[PDB]
Amino acid sequence: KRLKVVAAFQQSGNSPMGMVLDAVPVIPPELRPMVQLDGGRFATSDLNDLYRRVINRNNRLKRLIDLGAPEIIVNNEKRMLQESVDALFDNGRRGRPVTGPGNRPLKSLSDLLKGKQGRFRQNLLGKRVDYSGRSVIVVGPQLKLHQCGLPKLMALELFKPFVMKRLVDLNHAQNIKSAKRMVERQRPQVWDVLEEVIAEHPVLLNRAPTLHRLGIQAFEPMLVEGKAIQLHPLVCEAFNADFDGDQMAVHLPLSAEAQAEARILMLSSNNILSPASGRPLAMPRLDMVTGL
Amino acid sequence: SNNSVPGAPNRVSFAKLREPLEVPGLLDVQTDSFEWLIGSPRWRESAAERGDVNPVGGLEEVLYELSPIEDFSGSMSLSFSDPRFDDVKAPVDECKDKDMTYAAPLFVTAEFINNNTGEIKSQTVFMGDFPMMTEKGTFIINGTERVVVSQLVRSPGVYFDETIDKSTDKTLHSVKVIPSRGAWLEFDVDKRDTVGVRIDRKRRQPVTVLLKALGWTSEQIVERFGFSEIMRSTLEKDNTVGTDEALLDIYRKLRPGEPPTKESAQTLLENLFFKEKRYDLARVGRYKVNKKLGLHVGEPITSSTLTEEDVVATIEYLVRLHEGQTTMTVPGGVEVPVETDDIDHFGNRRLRTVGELIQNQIRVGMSRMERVVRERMTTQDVEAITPQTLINIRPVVAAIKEFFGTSQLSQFMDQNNPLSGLTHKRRLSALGPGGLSRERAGLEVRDVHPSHYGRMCPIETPEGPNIGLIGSLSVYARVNPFGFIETPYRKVVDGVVSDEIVYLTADEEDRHVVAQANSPIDADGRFVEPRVLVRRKAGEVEYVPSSEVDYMDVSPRQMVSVATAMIPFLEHDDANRALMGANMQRQAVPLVRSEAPLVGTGMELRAAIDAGDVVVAEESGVIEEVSADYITVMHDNGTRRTYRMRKFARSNHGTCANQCPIVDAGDRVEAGQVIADGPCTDDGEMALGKNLLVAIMPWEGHNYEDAIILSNRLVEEDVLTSIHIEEHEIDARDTKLGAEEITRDIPNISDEVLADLDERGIVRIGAEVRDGDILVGKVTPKGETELTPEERLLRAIFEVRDTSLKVPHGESGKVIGIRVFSREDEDELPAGVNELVRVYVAQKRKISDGDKLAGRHGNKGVIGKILPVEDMPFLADGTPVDIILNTHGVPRRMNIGQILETHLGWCAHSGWKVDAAKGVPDWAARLPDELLEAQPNAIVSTPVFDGAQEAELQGLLSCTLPNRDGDVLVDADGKAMLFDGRSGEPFPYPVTVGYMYIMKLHHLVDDKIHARSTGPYSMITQQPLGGKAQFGGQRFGEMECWAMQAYGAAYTLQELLTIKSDDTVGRVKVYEAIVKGENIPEPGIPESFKVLLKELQSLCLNVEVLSSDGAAIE
Amino acid sequence: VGSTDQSGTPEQSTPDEVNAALDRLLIADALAQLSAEHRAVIQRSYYRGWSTAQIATDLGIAEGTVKSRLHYAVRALRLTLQELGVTR
Amino acid sequence: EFIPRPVKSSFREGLTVLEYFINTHGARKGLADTALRTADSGYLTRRLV
Amino acid sequence: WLSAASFQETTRVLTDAAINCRSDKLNGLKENVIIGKLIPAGTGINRYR
Amino acid sequence: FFDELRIGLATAEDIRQWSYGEVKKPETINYRTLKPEKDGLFCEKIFGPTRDWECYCGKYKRVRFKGIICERCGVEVTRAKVRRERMGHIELA
RNA sequence: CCUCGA
DNA sequence: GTGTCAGTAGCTGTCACGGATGC
DNA sequence: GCATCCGTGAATCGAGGGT
């Protein structure tokens, strides 16, 4: 195990001296921002306190060296600079964490990447996206398997730029700028125009938890009144979605390739079978089997 | 009759057991705790008749522990006494409006005793604004009603634990002596058969090190613990010996880095455990130790401190338990069993309520001032010092503000409906300071404990991550001055039930055996059967002779919570659906008009009255003048009280709290009678929903698995219509380039949008405002150096910007109220604000597709379709049903209560008449005579675990009253023949038909619908915001990205993570490409990934992107 | 008082560039219908932010020539925008 | 281990007071461990992924 | 190392990455998802792309 | 399109090669003027201007000065986007 | 982080 | 400029598992 | 050479409210 570490410094050509630092970098300010409160006071990032406490002790060291302070103070100060820099990189790693106001351990640079709130899992493996929505789901027996019903007010905001384009083409609005004021004010012209836009434009429905890939399927949206999403009764098994207050999210594919991926790969009619067992899922399941 | 005490409607109960004790004040948990804290005359008289000797209020106990204050010499002394309150600063409703705190000024009497001059100056010192409790048990912090929740904490005392080792597979044992304050001390036996002790989390010292520090010789130690080889081996394996040697060993491990003096360690080792300064077991902590060890079992609780005798007897108790002993008597003490404690038993799990929780925060504030006092004493002169000069009340007011402002126990009050508020004031929370962390709660703290009987409800508990950590206080339960929860029981003398009622704690209850409430009892009191169901110690249930029963339960519903006692036919619903049934009643929405349920439980009256959202007359009298605005009562003596109705008030959760008078002009009203009822109330009963004509049948798939179909009659007649009110707010501040001004004059805004505004820019009362409409016109001046080149050219080719208050997306209603605060007009705003406007918008929400309805049995569902009144399957006489519930989602959940409720509901709607001729039939022999006949729309009671039996229910269906035409519509089975309104052909088979109480839950699509094209983005990560209120987008999480990869939709995945999210240039070119009709451009690099590289660099890691050639690219 | 890492503090947000992108698209259309002289003068005064004498020095024209071209080109753009219904 | 005393009643008949209470021990732990059984499941899934 | 640092033991992985001076061949589903490239699977493979 | 992502130990020379200046003073900002203090954790000479093309001393507030190092305040004039990418550093004694 | 919904 | 005693709160009511750390 | 003790991990999305 020692060779595993030593041979790494041998071949690569980097010196082991890098594990000892002579200078520490300062993270850009927008990544450690200081925000103002509605009461006039200020709230800052923990890193500014951590960086600030390192600077205070580093500036004190320059005083002690210049002043020729006793070797006990210079040595006992360097340790504090070591413990302070140890907190900047990974507070709490050694010993007791640097407590903030309220005996709360301050976040360190390494805490920015760990676990569900770290940069990797929270902001890289999953972002949060534009052109999306969510609402209550309601069963729609009349719907075909490839159909879903989204509320008019949901589709309007999702297709807002598409509606603005067509409102300005058909000369309902003078310019694209005024086309936006028409949708924001919900002028009656958009509801007839919106149908041309959403025509055969599939959308994706998602219900968490997304356990398997059949947790997301593509549908052809159908403008419905009301504010709930209308779901086909046969896809309830795949989503494992009952109707006692469940919510689903809607995502609008934009690019031509994205529409093709939803139309062919993710359309609900092309995913009748369970990928795990090969037995059907979109089949008569509850009331339907009793009737038969 | 049911609830014949205040003058309520006559609700008839199917009760077979009499109620010996009527329900106490359901709000007493908050009241008695706060009255004890301030020593109100009501609390003192309560402790007076309780038998108490020298009771102490909450303030008096903190002041006595503090008095007196002396320096190191003792020449100067300060003391406090007699705390009193002046009248309240501002009334309750005025505080909510002006965003201040409900408080009363606190006065104490302090005097300065000077030892070197022999003269004392005593005077009155104002201590601070003291937050006061409303009559409803709530506090008002900065205009928001809050509720201080009772906390379950580990009781002080001595506790023993038997742990099992992992590697050596031997039984280990440990002891903890948990004080009410100070340092901790835990002994343990490691796997080497040696005994040690950890002092305040510190290193584990041998148990003899403590004995040597106290002055005990090594021989006398062998004299006491010689019977065990594990203690003999401890003194042998010991490192240092000597009284002055182990005493320094403790000092350098307890306070390292300091010079060890023989008297600097002798001082703290006496102060940390035997001086009342830094250690104290409360009067309950001393009593809990005196039983476990069996010492001072007769002494009055006067020693508030640990003694060396306790430590020795404690170590003797531990060492015997390790080697199998089961009995021990302390030298000079009574015999006591040797066992381990539960720490979950409600005798070792203590409940501290508002007064105790506040006392600790006052105690911290006083101690912070005490240290300032001792320093200010030795600084000022010893003759011009007054109590005003020694007292700095800054840390005191900052301590109660810190608590109510920031505390896991000061919780935003639940105010959906009165039941939701009442339950919140009776909550028992295990989380919080001094308790435990949520990550520190195993599957054992959460499950039901046998000691919860009659104390904490085993049903009402959240099902989320807080399951088991939050309970509701049982109905008859109460809290003793010690902190434990008492519940009443009926003392059985000699196989005879007595009306003598005594409250027993958890451990007090185990020392006896109690019979179940529904035991057959003679009219004199003797049990009918020799064998009766009896609960025994350690949660053991078994039959036992009638001559063994010592006590028995007061009422059948003794074990449930207030909300649970409101579930009819509760004995037929599983705990799972019952939990949801009780948890969803607290989510009920106040309807426009309220109807009391036909099928009730009897709790509906006291739950509504004790909630405090109705108007009860304090003293008897007659109604002199009654208006929709106020009610004036002329008493018999001659005085007048006028009660003002709360009309269209915004609740904490947007529901409508609206009180309406019930009595009329010149109506004789007794004391304690409901003269006006508020939301979810009818004649004084909780009306959380409506009585709906239900049919249990599948209908064309619209009700498929738990969806609900409703008749449009509920829309046309506002049967399920509810009022919701939103508060909108904006302020005018001082900016860097001037000051924001609120004006009707807004740049580049038409006169048509501004047509509804007054001359100030404020919407006028009564205007209907859609989303996006302007409510308050505010413009802020923007500097020239902040202008876009196009914005500057557009400004050149043609200094304030628009910051008007607009209506958020999804809001709509009538503007009902405006409140304006101006610094110019004496209005005290935060520094930097000149004017503040709040606009109240009220919406009338009819029932819509997707709104969530539910019953009392966890039977929930959304509205899938609202058919017209003619499409609904209608009964034989033409009356169409109101709601259709799918049958498949009924027998799985095991919630038969809805079936029994549906049947009884119909019998209540139609009425019945039992054949009295030829005697009383054999099934109704147990029914009271008041039930043999019932008129239509009769009110009935099915008490929990009592009430209607299935045999009696079957008989009522046989004698259901006929309709107005003389026809009986439902069969004895309870089903009826329905006609399909769409085709006309009658349905082939009879269908269960009846009336069920359905509540409209606070989960409406009008609030939960959301959609976003673009909007705000987080500055750091450049990803879209979250939440509907911020106009955010949905989160394509990790599992959802696996779904795209599973589909192989690579381009969709890149689109999601690039142009649709954090591509700074890619998202804009998509927006441009859409309005141009061009194709979607190529996605760029996520700005969030750029941040990642810059974060790895900040950790001294050199990350670089290399091209195909090998050159690093920037 | 506050720490951004600590809960209870609102995160900073920046609005979307939709309104700015639409104006930029309409300005780019009205700009294309201008002479090469007028277009090359408004793009040096508003897009580059130079002074009147700086544009006169670059283009090798008189001082008042830049003032006159800017004076018309602005009105020429106002003609094209009002013809397309751009709000004043 | 199973209780040496059973729940004799049926939900149609009506549980006794103690019967309902003794039922909740397993019912609540039925919900409690179900949240834990789903947590270890979802963690195993992301390791397999 | 980017696919591993995003799984478990982030600090323990990034340390070994800097000692070994590891280079990440950006050719993987988890890696390309992070930076925003097309995943090498489904419609992202070179045959169909 | 970039193939490899290399990671390694940051030499003290790399730490200085990244940093646009050393953070000497411990101050943050001014609590009256909202101006970041010079050589502080928000120094505009090091990290960048608070507002676009606006320097600290106020001499250059216009776009015409693209790339000018102000002589009285030492602040560059680019967009405030650089305050998201310019690193600082502390030289340890 | 308090409460809550699938 | 400073000068007699002048001394945290809080807290352990999580656990399985592996391997470097340490007697 | 081995017991201890250190550090790592512990489901997804969503609403509203305080400091």
Encoded amino acid at B377, one letter: M
Q: Do F5 and E21 touch (CB under 8 A)?
A: no
- Give yes or no for CB of B428 within 7 Å of strand H: no
Nucleotide nearest to A206 (CA to C1'): I13
C-alpha distances in angstroms, B397 versus B61, B139, B752, D7? Answer: 18, 16, 52, 56
> CB burial class (10 A; 0-12, 13-18, 19+) of residue F26?
buried
Give ∠ CA B318-B321-B325 in degrees, rounded to 5: 135
Q: Do A251 and B1048 touch (CB under 8 A)?
A: no
Output the distance from B981 CA to H8 C1' rounded to whole Å.
77
Tokens of B203: 């290193």
Q: Do B1102 and F9 touch (CB under 8 A)?
A: yes
Encoded amino acid at B324, one letter: G
Distance from CA of F10 to the nearest CA of B (A): 5
Query: What is residue F45's DSSP assignment?
Result: T
Contact B883, B562 (CB under 8 A): no
Nearest by CB: E18 against F3, F5, F7: F7
Tokens of B427: 């909550």
Contact B782, B737 (CB under 8 A): yes
Nucleotide nearest to B436 (CA to C1'): H13
Contact B835, B742 (CB under 8 A): yes
Nearest by CB: B1042 against D5, D15, D49: D49
Contact B956, B938 (CB under 8 A): no
Q: What is the DSSP string of B954-978?
A: HHHHHTBPP-TTS---B-TTSEE--
Question: Chain E contacts of A110, Cβ < 8 Å?
Answer: 10-11
Chains that touch F (3 or more CB pairs under 8 A): A, B, C, E
Q: Do D12 and B950 touch (CB under 8 A)?
A: yes
| Chain I nucleotides with an atom closer than 7 Å to a protein C-beta | 4, 7-19
Nearest by CB: F88 against A15, A25, A52: A25
Based on its alpha-carbon atoms, the radius of gyration of chain A, rounded to whole angstroms, reads 30
The per-residue b/e assignment along B697-730, b for 16 or more CB within 10 angstroms, e otherwise, is bbbbbbbbbbbbbbbbbbbeeebbbbbbbbebeb
Encoded amino acid at A71, one letter: E
Q: Is C23 on the interface with A (CB under 8 A)?
A: yes
State the method.
Answer: X-ray
Three-state SS for chain A is CHHHHHHHHHHHCCCHHHHCCCEEEECCHHHCCEEECCCCCEEECHHHHHHHHHHHHHHHHHHHHHHCCCHHHHHHHHHHHHHHHHHHHHCCCCCCCCECCCCCECCCHHHHCCCCCCHHHHHCCCCECCCEEEEEEEECCCCCCCEEEEEHHHHHHHCHHHHHHHHHHCCCCCCHHHHHHHHHHCCCHHHHHHHHHCCCCCEEEECCCCCCHHHEEEEEEEEECCCCEEECHHHHHHHCCCCCCCEEEEECCCCHHHHHHHHHHCEHHHCCECCCCCCECCCCCCHHHHHC
Q: Do B516 and D17 touch (CB under 8 A)?
A: yes
Encoded amino acid at C27, one letter: I
Contact B565, B458 (CB under 8 A): no
Q: Do B1102 and F54 touch (CB under 8 A)?
A: no
C-alpha distances in angstroms, B1073 versus A95, A190, A201, B366, C21? Answer: 55, 20, 17, 67, 11
Nucleotide nearest to A209 (CA to C1'): I12
How many residues can be counted in chain C? 88
Tokens of B226: 């010689």
Alpha carbons B585 and B595: distance in angstroms, whole number: 15
Alpha carbons B547 and A219: distance in angstroms, whole number: 72
Q: Which of residues 32-71 of F touch C (CB under 8 A)?
A: 62-64
Check the annotation: does F55 bind a ligand: yes
Check the annotation: does A242 bind a ligand: yes
- Sequence-ordered list of residues with C-beta below 8 angstroms from that of B459, at least 6 positions apart, any chain: B560, B561, B564, B575, B578, B579, B582, D24
Resolution in A: 3.8
Question: Chain C contacts of B1077, Cβ < 8 Å?
Answer: none
C-alpha distances in angstroms, B1103 versus B433, B943, B1090, F6? Answer: 43, 71, 11, 5
Which of the residues C14, C22, C52, C86 would you substitute to probe the B interface, choosing the one with the greatest number of B C-beta atoms within 10 Å?
C14
Q: What is the interface size between A and F, counted as CB pairs within 8 Å?
A: 95
**Strand H contacts (CB < 7 A) among B residues 247-286?**
255, 258, 264, 278
Q: Do B1045 and E43 touch (CB under 8 A)?
A: no
- Give yes or no for CB of B437 within 7 Å of strand H: yes
Output the distance from B183 CA to H23 C1' rounded to whole Å.
31
Output the distance from E45 CA to H17 C1' rounded to whole Å.
39
> CB burial class (10 A; 0-12, 13-18, 19+) of residue B672?
middle
B574: nearest Cα among B946, B857, B941: B857
Domain extent for C80? 5-88
Nearest by CB: F4 against E14, E18, E23: E23
> CB burial class (10 A; 0-12, 13-18, 19+) of residue B222?
middle
Alpha carbons B180 and B280: distance in angstroms, whole number: 6
Question: Chain A contacts of C5, Cβ < 8 Å?
Answer: 45-46, 106-107
B659: nearest Cα among B648, B669, B667, B670: B648
Question: Chain E contacts of B1098, Cβ < 8 Å?
Answer: none
Tokens of B1002: 């606070």
How many other C-beta atoms can be found within 10 angstroms of the C-beta atom of residue C68?
13
C-alpha distances in angstroms, B170 versus B204, B206, B232, B796, B1088? Answer: 20, 20, 19, 88, 54
Q: What is the interface size between B and C, counted as CB pairs within 8 Å?
A: 62
Check the annotation: does F70 bind a ligand: yes
Coil vs helix vs strand at B1028: coil
Tokens of B151: 């906390």
Number of domains composing chain C: 1
Nearest by CB: B518 against D17, D28, D33: D17
Output the distance from B276 CA to H8 C1' rounded to whole Å.
19
Give ∠ CA B765-B770-B773 in degrees, rounded to 5: 80
Minimal-distance CA residue of chain A relative to F11: A18
B1045: nearest Cα among E40, C69, A233: E40
Q: Is C4 on the interface with A (CB under 8 A)?
A: yes
How many other C-beta atoms can be found within 10 angstroms of the C-beta atom of residue B321?
20
Alpha carbons A167 and A178: distance in angstroms, whole number: 9
Q: Do A120 and E11 touch (CB under 8 A)?
A: no
DSSP-assigned beta bridge partners for residue B111:
B79, B122
Question: Chain C contacts of B791, Cβ < 8 Å?
Answer: 20, 23
